[PDB]
Amino acid sequence: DPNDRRLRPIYDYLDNGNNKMAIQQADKLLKKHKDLHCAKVLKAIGLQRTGKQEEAFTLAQEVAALEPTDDNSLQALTILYREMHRPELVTKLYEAAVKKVPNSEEYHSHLFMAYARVGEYKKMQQAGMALYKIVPKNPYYFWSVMSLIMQSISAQDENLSKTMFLPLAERMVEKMVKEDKIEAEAEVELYYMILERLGKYQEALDVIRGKLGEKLTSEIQSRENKCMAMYKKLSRWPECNALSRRLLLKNSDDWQFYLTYFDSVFRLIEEAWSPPAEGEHSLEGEVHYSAEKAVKFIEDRITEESKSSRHLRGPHLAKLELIRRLRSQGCNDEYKLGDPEELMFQYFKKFGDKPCCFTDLKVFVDLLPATQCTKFINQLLGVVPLSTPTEDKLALPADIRALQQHLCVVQLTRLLGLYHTMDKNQKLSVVRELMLRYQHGLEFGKTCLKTELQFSDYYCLLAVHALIDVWRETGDETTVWQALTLLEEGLTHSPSNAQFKLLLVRIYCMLGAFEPVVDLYSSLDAKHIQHDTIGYLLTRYAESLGQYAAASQSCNFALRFFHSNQKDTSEYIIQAYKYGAFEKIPEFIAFRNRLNNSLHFAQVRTERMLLDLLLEANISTSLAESIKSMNLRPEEDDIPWEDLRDNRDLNVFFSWDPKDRDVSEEHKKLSLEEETLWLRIRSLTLRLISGLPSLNSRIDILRLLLQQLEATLETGKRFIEKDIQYPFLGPVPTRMGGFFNSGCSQCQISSFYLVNDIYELDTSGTMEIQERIENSFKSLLDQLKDVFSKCKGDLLEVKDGNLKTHPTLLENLVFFVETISVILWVSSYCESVLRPYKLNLQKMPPVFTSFQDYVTGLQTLISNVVDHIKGLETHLIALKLEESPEERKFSKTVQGKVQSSYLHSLLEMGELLKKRLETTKKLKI
Amino acid sequence: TTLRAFTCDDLFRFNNINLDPLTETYGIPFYLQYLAHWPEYFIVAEAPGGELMGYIMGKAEGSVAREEWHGHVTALSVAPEFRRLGLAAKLMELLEEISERKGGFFVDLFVRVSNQVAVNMYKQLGYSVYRTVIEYYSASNGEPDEDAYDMRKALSRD
């Protein structure tokens, strides 16, 4: 085809992003021939890639009106439609194409394929049935069956699905079986899924155990898993027990089978089941039904694993679990298993050097009585071969083994809760000892590469944790500075560490500085899926500190990732449908829904909305063009409150605190509720702001939204009154407390009431309304003055050679900036509506004088705030922060970084305020 | 330990593994394609406490006519605190067995040149170096594009 050769230049141009030259070459090509619709659609695609969609959309509509037939044009139109997420058009396109040629099986397949991309289940079922009618192939029939299954799943009515679709699918598959046409293995999976979803467990188990079960060979032990599931559903305990025993005999390092065997044998003992008189006492093999048999089997596994040179951690943990379950059940006359403390000591002795010992012991540590925990720790200290402790030096290890054992011992000591008993001085002594141990142990890893962690970073982690606990207990920032210095020094030696970067980011964000945070996060090298998991740390702090550029960049990255997900997940589940992995379709659908209902997605979307509206509200546009191009309406909403899902990982930080002080599901629930409240408040505020230009019946909608906002604010205050404390490494509190303490909510509500009053006056057009307007103006001015007065102070303070920080002032300044921007918008609308009244009256209402005085007061307040910001900057730059040497240098560097971050934030704030001040000249009516 | 098939929901809990600089983080299309096309080549280990030690992800391709039908290893990672336990050897043995059951011919994988420990452990496992490819790793952040070693091992069918 010569046309493909002609398109090859623009083909590679689009491949390389050469949009302009592609458009030029397409124009040159179409100058000779006017029937080359592919050239036109390629030009439209290139225009869309450059941000020209309306002309591209018109060209696409024009070429679609022609109803083409060549495959290349169809592919190009498909790509173009998927560019702005418009898959419904290709459905009609392929419908017309198959209308032209009804006997084309490829066209029917493509039409069904586009339907499956969309999700019209009856249509895919009909298309698949028609395709099978055209060509008798099993895969199309099973495609139709899967379409019916998905239609049943989608429907909420359980009875309707269990009565209409599932019986029909079962009848279809039964007819297929009667015809004896089951060849591949996917049909068996589909049949089993259909039978299981209908509740006929016995028939599914029979069909799996039958001849058709032999076709399941691609996977490993799949038949065993399905039999386990069926037995658990049917409560056929002896069979599951026998199968679990056989599988454990096969491989003796599987935890799930150990748990299943224990549960089965305990259920057997509870039911007092007895073996049959004759024949095998199972469908699988031997069955154990006595605790003596269980302990004998466990001992046999232990002694069999002992002989093998390779070491496994299975049987010992299984013995510990059996001890726990025997204790729980009530068999106090235990069958000579042993003292749990002795077993723990032996296990630690055998696996001292392995880094995973602590994690294994944490699960069972609850068995140890709290009376002799210190004695147990002392006993543990007697095996480690430490050097002799002299007067001026501590006992030190000799190689990697001793160091790892001592580290594990220290971790276990911290876990038991001893460290939460002594006072400040003993904690400081422990910190010094840990620091000395880390410094001594740093010598071993001299030859380690840059991509491998050092051997003693956990000493620094423990010291940092202790210092943070001390600071939280008493509140002395010198400990914070020391911890920051220690963390920086540790990160200097091991650039590849990950926990250090996260701890540094959290501490810096807590202290109010933000400049190093972006660099540290970039060094962390996050990517697509990690965004939705660990981007909340950046998104919760980027906006609150005035660093607008970083917030914009992060929001852009997150939005790009989410849009790419929304575009490509459907395509890849489509491909999975094509291949034949039927059982993976519902899981794919659930995964896509989970990703589409992420809380972080809505949070970043709303934050980007508000930031884009605020940055270029009136300095660039008139707040009307931005809204129109921004697609916002008061009634429209796209936040799924009923299906909000949380995906943030709260366990990324390594922890060693006891169970009581660790995170809990209650904390997660409270954090989710607080985040939902904050998101609701932000969304309501954005929606209320959005509908303002349309005021030039909606008043009722605005009043309803205002009432909802007031109720939400009341609920938020009630929740704040609870005074819930969070763990340091757990969820971080939101900004609601600072928002309430600042008092900007009253100013915004007063502005909204003033807007309502002026709109009512305009509709009516009275003296009482004018007096109310004047009183509202005076109250707004007083509230703004009070809010500004609440922000006065100093950011960095020097006292006795120590530094003190006050991020609350920065947060108050941010809230003040947002409030004054909103007030400026409201005043602009008020002047816009009021100006024609005075213009007509010129052909004496005291409202004009009050408005002019209010404008002058606003300008004076803005000038005073700008001057105060400049004075704060001048004081900050003139600060003389200069007042082992390496630690002092690190502390100086940390202080310099904090000062630079504060200066950058203040400069950005001053620039924004100076830009916003100029706009007040248009209000001089 | 506990070995089971990888699932989509596990993508939200494996963050404690990819933080290692030596391990990558592919996009959603890569994981979705590998899971849909070859579900059996996706194994993940789960700890008694609920954590994930590591996972192994691979694929099979080639031409049987030219005896190119072979298994390929895409990704293999282990958590830093769960190493020195032979988990990688167990996963590699499982992949070798499952590829042998499919009538393959050999197994191959790429490796970083500077990653000396991985090369040594592979050589200990009977794997013999095949060849070297120049500038395979498209390094970012200004780092030089490190070359890669084409690592190979035979099978029993031949």
Add this chain to the structure above:
Amino acid sequence: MDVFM
């Protein structure tokens, strides 16, 4: 390991 693509 392979390249990200």
